[PDB]
Amino acid sequence: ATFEIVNRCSYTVWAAASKGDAALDAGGRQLNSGESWTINVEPGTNGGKIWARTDCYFDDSGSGICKTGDCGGLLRCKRFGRPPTTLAEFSLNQYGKDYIDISNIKGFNVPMDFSPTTRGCRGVRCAADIVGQCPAKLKAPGGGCNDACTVFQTSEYCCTTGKCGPTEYSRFFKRLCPDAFSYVLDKPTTVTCPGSSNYRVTFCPTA
């Protein structure tokens, strides 16, 4: 599958692509404003994620640190990133279908559109100014807006035991971005696409 990752933000972002135990394609790339990166994602990739990282620096060996979304200090991500991270999530060729979503469960850093570039299903977007509107306790010191699980680390917010429900914090993300997951047990906003679709992830999508 082809994924085009496009940075339309005014700021640089360091794109990342991983399935949690390995990079997808090169795993990461610096994208200055307006740049894109086209990757190949293998068919059958399950539990893949693409995200932006902000305010990074790396040395010539590709080791360094990002203020949002850092993946073990690497340019070329092998593992998922540190919150806060707006997440484009996908599982491909799953019993004949692809499944895509955007999630704020791990917070929000950069606005995102995640759309097919082939026919037959909708895209989703979360492009409200969540960072500017972020409630005080969720503001991350390095920038972006943490989820309440990362901040409070209890099942009330993490949905590890019993049956978690919405909180004022989850409702904040949901109100700003109805089409993204706001907590683990949110009513799903996943889109079912034809198997073997192609996609575009756009940071700071055009309104």
The full set of domain ranges for the chain reads 1-207
CA–CA gap between residue 127 and residue 178 (Å, rounded): 11
CA–CA gap between residue 146 and residue 190 (Å, rounded): 22
Helix (H, G, I), strand (E, B) or coil at 49: strand
Q: How far is CA 62 from CA 49, 72, 77, 140, in A?
A: 20, 11, 10, 25
CA–CA gap between residue 177 and residue 154 (Å, rounded): 23
Q: Which residue has the tokens 């539990």?
A: 47
Q: Please state which CATH number belongs to domain 1-207.
A: 2.60.110.10
Neighbours of 36 (CB within 10 A): 15
Which stretches within 15-158 are classed as H helix? 130-133, 148-152, 155-158
Q: For the chain, how many residues are written?
A: 207
Q: Using what technique was this structure determined?
A: X-ray
